[PDB]
Structure 1
Amino acid sequence: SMKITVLGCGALGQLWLTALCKQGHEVQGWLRVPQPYCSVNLVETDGSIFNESLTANDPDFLATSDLLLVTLKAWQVSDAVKSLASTLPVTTPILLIHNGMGTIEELQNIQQPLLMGTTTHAARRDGNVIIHVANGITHIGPARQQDGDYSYLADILQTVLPDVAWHNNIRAELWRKLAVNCVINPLTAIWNCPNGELRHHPQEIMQICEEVAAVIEREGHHTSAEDLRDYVMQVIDATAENISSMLQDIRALRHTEIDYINGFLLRRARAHGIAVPENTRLFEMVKRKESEY
């Protein structure tokens, strides 16, 4: 029924391409370097394997797509989206799913309906396959004031890769994800540790949460440092044995998403005159680790 272009055919993109294929939707990948085909290779939670070769980089397929689904790293997002937006119909919604925040600020002139999403699914590259590590929920809603009700997408996507929840205002959700990510990613990348080690660092966590709560406050959302801290510990307790995405990036010598996590927090703090010494130091530490490669 649906025709979807997936931009960013990595771990997340392949997860969605597989799911969308199993429900009989028409899909293609959009790759950085144009190629004969997009190969999709996915090991599901049980152990089953999906192997397909799909259309890639077809501009006509793009011009007649019902949705652009974007599953790029946050620093890759807005240049890639801008370059596809003049071919995609002015009416086709663009759904951004990434960690961090700050991309919407880079996409103010997009004429398409723009949607933002967070997900707790986990998918990992293991050599040449993607492994679906965990199931989860994807929260989606409008990116901007002008973007309307595309809740119909949530219904459709619930039948593809549950669970999916639509929110008329997604901001609170982005901030709560940003808060946990400001804690776990830089600290794990710095200490080279599994998430669960952070349970030994309650003072540092709480210091970061106080800074985040102060900014979220000024951005017009009711929270407290204690509430954010409680949520960080839930996430830590749930993921105790995991290697965070930022630590995985570090270990693998890839560029990190720091500019859209703590980096974005710093941008919002500075815009309001909120001193965030601890987030600043974590940001500098991650940037430094990256300069060693």
Structure 2
Amino acid sequence: MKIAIAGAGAMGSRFGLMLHQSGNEVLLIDGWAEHVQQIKEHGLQANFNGKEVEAKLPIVLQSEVEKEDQVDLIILFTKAMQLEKMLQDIQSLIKKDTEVLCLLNGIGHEDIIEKFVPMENIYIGNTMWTAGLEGPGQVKLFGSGSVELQNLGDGKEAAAKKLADKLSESGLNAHFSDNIHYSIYRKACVNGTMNGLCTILDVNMAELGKTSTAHKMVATIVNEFAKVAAVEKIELDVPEVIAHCESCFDPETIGLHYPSMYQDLIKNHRLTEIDYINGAISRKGKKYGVATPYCDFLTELVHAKEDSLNVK
């Protein structure tokens, strides 16, 4: 099939590369002009599991997408703050039958996606794959991963399973889930603890785990996520989710890495996705009458940090 990767940064480049290596036709769509020009002239370059790889993937600036152009599957992989503008720029690509899959971190992206895409064509999930964008046209891809996804449209279960199988045929290890909202919240707890705490404390995940108060901070935040999720009839298994968060402390899994939010703000001086993670829990709390002070304070701290570095 024809697959467009809308947002061809670290993760988008991974998925595009893997989907291309299995014989899919892949179009990359991106908003970073220098990145697009590099890929045009020299292809996408990857340190892929140690091996230098190059692939000439077609790429277009999101503002230059052709209303004549058309794909079967759009995979969204922008950062949360770029999602709307990306959808505005590529709407003409959204035809009757086009599947649209969102695998961004954070909560609530469906609402935005539903302004541009018919409900029956929306698939959402999250992923445990990782990736790094080293500079224009350059990515570093290590580790293993998985994808979970579910259809949001009534009667699209089989189409969702098919979509997961298709991704799995390119090595993406994708699974259909019958409770994607539970799965999104659970992963959001990980992003809601590791990302902001590492960023503010200036540590990697193993270093965070070594501190005497990490467990208390993680557990308090996870409880706040769970109280908000319960209002939406999602009952998180808090002890399992706390343990799932703390498993990131292990050097043998992902502990030696810095989370994406750290790479964004501390290393690259870019705005973070905090409003969509802890911030989403704060805004829900206010609306539901649930106290979410740690999410409020962590969000505030991260914004302050962004401001202190003069980030956008």
State TM-score, norm by structure 2.
0.86
1:203 to 1:9, Cα distance in 2 relative to 1, 3 A: same
Change in 2 beyond 3 A, CA 1:52/1:61: farther
Most deviating of 85-94 and 157-166: 85-94
| Residue 276 of structure 2 corresponds to residue 260 of structure 1 | yes
SS at match of 1:6: strand
Contact 2:67–2:92 (Cα < 8 Å) also in 1: no
Match among 241, 244, 249 for residue 231 of structure 1: 244
Is the contact between residue 114 and residue 147 of structure 1 (CA under 8 Å) also seen in structure 2?
A: no
Q: 1:53 to 1:225 in 2, by over 3 A?
A: closer
Distance in 1 of aligned mates of 2:263 and 2:27: 28
Consecutive aligned runs of 4 or more in structure 1 exceeding 6 Å deviation: none
Q: Which residue of 2 aligns with 1:74?
A: 80
| Alpha-carbon distance change, 174 to 250 in structure 1, aligned in 2, over 3 angstroms | same
**Paired residue for 2:44?**
40
Question: 1:89 is matched with which residue?
Answer: 95
Q: Secondary structure at the match of 1:29?
A: strand
1:137 counterpart residue number: 146
Q: What do the CA deviations read for 1:178-235 (whole angstroms, capped 9, x no partner)?
A: 1111111111111000111222221111111221121122221222432221111123
Contact 1:29/1:54 (<8 A) preserved: yes
The aligned residue for residue 52 of structure 1 is 56
Report the aligned-residue RMSD: 2.0
CA contact (8 A) 2:222 2:242 kept: yes
Aligned pairs (5 A) from 1:137-216: 137-142=146-151, 144-146=152-154, 148-149=156-157, 150=159, 151-199=161-209, 200=211, 201-216=214-229
Structure 1 length as normaliser, TM-score?
Answer: 0.92
Structure 1 position 145, deviation (Å) = 4.8
- Give the Cα separation in 2 of the matches to 1:185 and 1:132: 19
Match of 1:25 in 2: 24
Relative distance call for 1:148 and 1:9 in structure 2 (3 A) is same
Aligned partners of 2:206 and 2:248 also within 8 Å? no
Shift of 1:53: 4.1
Which residue of 1 is the match for residue 256 of structure 2? Answer: 241
Quick check: 2:205–2:259 contact (8 Å CA) kept in 1? yes
**Corresponding residue of 1:121:** 129
Deviations 1:100-121 (A, max 9, x none): 1122122333216111121111
The alignment-based identity, stated in percent, is 24
The offset of 1:146, in angstroms, is 4.2
Deviations 1:235-287 (A, max 9, x none): 33232111111111121210101011111111222221100111110010001
State the distance in 1 between where 2:69 and 2:107 align.
Answer: 26
CA 1:111–1:256 in 2, change beyond 3 Å: closer, same or farther? same
Structure 1 spans left out of the alignment, 5+ residues = none
Structure 1 residues 72-116: Cα deviation after superposition (integer angstroms, max 9, x where no partner): 111111231233234321221101121111221223332161111
Q: Secondary structure of 2:203's partner? A: coil
Compared with structure 1, are the counterparts of its residues 53 and 68 closer, same or farther at alpha carbon in structure 2 (3 Å cutoff)?
Answer: closer
Residues 23, 60 of structure 1: alpha-carbon distance in 2 compared, 3 angstrom cutoff: farther
**Alignment of 1:217 onto 2:230:** yes
